[PDB]
Design a protein around this motif. Sequence first.
Motif, PDB file in Angstrom:
ATOM      1  N   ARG A   1       3.564  -1.141  41.312  1.00 51.01           N
ATOM      2  CA  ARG A   1       3.056  -1.803  40.272  1.00 51.01           C
ATOM      3  C   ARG A   1       2.129  -0.778  39.140  1.00 51.01           C
ATOM      4  O   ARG A   1       1.057  -1.051  38.716  1.00 51.01           O
ATOM      5  N   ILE A   2       2.646   0.201  38.889  1.00 46.57           N
ATOM      6  CA  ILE A   2       2.011   0.951  37.719  1.00 46.57           C
ATOM      7  C   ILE A   2       2.128   0.729  36.313  1.00 46.57           C
ATOM      8  O   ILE A   2       3.046   1.132  35.725  1.00 46.57           O
ATOM      9  N   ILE A   3       1.285  -0.126  35.952  1.00 45.25           N
ATOM     10  CA  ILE A   3       1.604  -0.592  34.332  1.00 45.25           C
ATOM     11  C   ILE A   3       1.321   0.789  33.513  1.00 45.25           C
ATOM     12  O   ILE A   3       0.295   1.443  33.635  1.00 45.25           O
ATOM     13  N   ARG A   4       2.058   0.746  32.201  1.00 46.83           N
ATOM     14  CA  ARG A   4       1.967   1.983  31.537  1.00 46.83           C
ATOM     15  C   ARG A   4       2.228   1.221  29.943  1.00 46.83           C
ATOM     16  O   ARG A   4       2.529   0.088  29.924  1.00 46.83           O
ATOM     17  N   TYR A   5       1.992   2.407  29.183  1.00 47.86           N
ATOM     18  CA  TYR A   5       2.191   1.826  27.715  1.00 47.86           C
ATOM     19  C   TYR A   5       3.367   2.878  27.201  1.00 47.86           C
ATOM     20  O   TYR A   5       3.663   3.775  27.592  1.00 47.86           O
ATOM     21  N   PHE A   6       4.277   2.482  26.169  1.00 49.07           N
ATOM     22  CA  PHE A   6       5.555   2.966  25.506  1.00 49.07           C
ATOM     23  C   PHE A   6       5.382   2.902  24.183  1.00 49.07           C
ATOM     24  O   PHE A   6       4.812   2.200  23.311  1.00 49.07           O
ATOM     25  N   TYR A   7       6.481   3.817  23.653  1.00 46.69           N
ATOM     26  CA  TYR A   7       6.811   3.462  22.143  1.00 46.69           C
ATOM     27  C   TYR A   7       8.201   2.563  21.923  1.00 46.69           C
ATOM     28  O   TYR A   7       9.052   2.911  22.071  1.00 46.69           O
ATOM     29  N   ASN A   8       7.911   1.582  21.348  1.00 45.96           N
ATOM     30  CA  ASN A   8       8.897   0.550  20.846  1.00 45.96           C
ATOM     31  C   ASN A   8       9.843   1.011  19.730  1.00 45.96           C
ATOM     32  O   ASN A   8       9.375   0.521  18.627  1.00 45.96           O
TER      33      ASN A   8
ATOM     34  N   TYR B   1       6.102   0.818  34.814  1.00 44.05           N
ATOM     35  CA  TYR B   1       6.709   2.110  35.375  1.00 44.05           C
ATOM     36  C   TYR B   1       6.813   2.117  36.927  1.00 44.05           C
ATOM     37  O   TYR B   1       6.312   1.391  37.681  1.00 44.05           O
ATOM     38  N   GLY B   2       8.290   2.380  37.404  1.00 47.14           N
ATOM     39  CA  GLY B   2       8.547   2.382  38.677  1.00 47.14           C
ATOM     40  C   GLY B   2       7.646   3.181  39.653  1.00 47.14           C
ATOM     41  O   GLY B   2       7.341   3.075  40.545  1.00 47.14           O
ATOM     42  N   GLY B   3       7.595   4.498  39.013  1.00 47.94           N
ATOM     43  CA  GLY B   3       6.770   5.587  39.924  1.00 47.94           C
ATOM     44  C   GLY B   3       7.617   6.565  40.042  1.00 47.94           C
ATOM     45  O   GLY B   3       7.050   7.999  40.134  1.00 47.94           O
ATOM     46  N   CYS B   4       8.848   6.642  39.821  1.00 51.28           N
ATOM     47  CA  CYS B   4       9.867   7.934  40.125  1.00 51.28           C
ATOM     48  C   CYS B   4      10.887   8.126  38.836  1.00 51.28           C
ATOM     49  O   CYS B   4      11.366   6.886  38.276  1.00 51.28           O
ATOM     50  N   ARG B   5      11.503   8.970  38.485  1.00 52.20           N
ATOM     51  CA  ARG B   5      12.334   9.190  37.535  1.00 52.20           C
ATOM     52  C   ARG B   5      11.927   8.670  36.109  1.00 52.20           C
ATOM     53  O   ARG B   5      12.526   7.878  35.450  1.00 52.20           O
ATOM     54  N   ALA B   6      10.715   8.989  35.692  1.00 54.79           N
ATOM     55  CA  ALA B   6      10.156   8.427  34.388  1.00 54.79           C
ATOM     56  C   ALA B   6      10.827   9.070  33.225  1.00 54.79           C
ATOM     57  O   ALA B   6      12.021   9.727  33.438  1.00 54.79           O
ATOM     58  N   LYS B   7      10.739   8.801  31.979  1.00 55.70           N
ATOM     59  CA  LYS B   7      11.234   9.551  30.722  1.00 55.70           C
ATOM     60  C   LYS B   7      10.232   9.908  29.817  1.00 55.70           C
ATOM     61  O   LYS B   7       8.957  10.008  29.963  1.00 55.70           O
ATOM     62  N   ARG B   8      10.670  10.306  28.637  1.00 53.69           N
ATOM     63  CA  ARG B   8       9.614  10.951  27.551  1.00 53.69           C
ATOM     64  C   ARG B   8       8.709   9.923  27.045  1.00 53.69           C
ATOM     65  O   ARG B   8       7.701   9.841  26.918  1.00 53.69           O
ATOM     66  N   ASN B   9       9.633   8.618  26.583  1.00 55.29           N
ATOM     67  CA  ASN B   9       8.852   7.467  26.112  1.00 55.29           C
ATOM     68  C   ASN B   9       8.010   7.197  27.200  1.00 55.29           C
ATOM     69  O   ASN B   9       8.215   6.328  28.048  1.00 55.29           O
ATOM     70  N   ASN B  10       6.697   7.481  27.184  1.00 60.49           N
ATOM     71  CA  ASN B  10       5.710   7.242  28.337  1.00 60.49           C
ATOM     72  C   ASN B  10       4.126   7.408  28.140  1.00 60.49           C
ATOM     73  O   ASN B  10       4.122   8.573  27.833  1.00 60.49           O
ATOM     74  N   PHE B  11       3.483   6.693  28.054  1.00 62.43           N
ATOM     75  CA  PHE B  11       1.951   6.875  27.632  1.00 62.43           C
ATOM     76  C   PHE B  11       1.045   6.116  28.762  1.00 62.43           C
ATOM     77  O   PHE B  11       1.411   5.391  29.452  1.00 62.43           O
TER      78      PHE B  11
ATOM     79  N   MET C   1       0.390   5.615  20.123  1.00 55.13           N
ATOM     80  CA  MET C   1       0.365   5.356  18.412  1.00 55.13           C
ATOM     81  C   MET C   1      -0.104   6.972  17.969  1.00 55.13           C
ATOM     82  O   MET C   1       0.439   7.123  16.903  1.00 55.13           O
ATOM     83  N   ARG C   2      -1.157   7.516  18.408  1.00 50.39           N
ATOM     84  CA  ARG C   2      -1.595   8.807  17.699  1.00 50.39           C
ATOM     85  C   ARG C   2      -0.417   9.797  18.197  1.00 50.39           C
ATOM     86  O   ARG C   2      -0.448  10.997  17.584  1.00 50.39           O
ATOM     87  N   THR C   3       0.345   9.489  19.262  1.00 50.84           N
ATOM     88  CA  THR C   3       1.148  10.860  19.535  1.00 50.84           C
ATOM     89  C   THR C   3       2.737  10.498  19.161  1.00 50.84           C
ATOM     90  O   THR C   3       3.183  11.296  18.395  1.00 50.84           O
ATOM     91  N   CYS C   4       3.378   9.485  19.557  1.00 52.38           N
ATOM     92  CA  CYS C   4       4.749   9.172  19.150  1.00 52.38           C
ATOM     93  C   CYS C   4       4.618   8.542  17.745  1.00 52.38           C
ATOM     94  O   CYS C   4       5.408   8.520  16.851  1.00 52.38           O
TER      95      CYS C   4
END
Length: 58
Positions: free
Chosen positions: A17-24, A35-45, A52-55
């Motif tokens: 249950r790790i809620i996170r933010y991403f770029y749509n 986020y599941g917790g394992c095997r994440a990707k670049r789109n991740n904040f 917003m300030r990064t991607c």
Amino acid sequence: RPDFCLEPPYTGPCKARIIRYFYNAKAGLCQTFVYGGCRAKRNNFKSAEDCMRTCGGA
């Protein structure tokens, strides 16, 4: 929205249950997700401000 703004949201096999933010990239704005917790990707904040300030940027 540089490179780390194309690969879409990827939760992976885990479901911690790790809620996170991403770029749509579907509309050109950051958004929220889970986020599941394992095997994440670049789109991740951790905050929309961060994505917003990064991607996002513009």
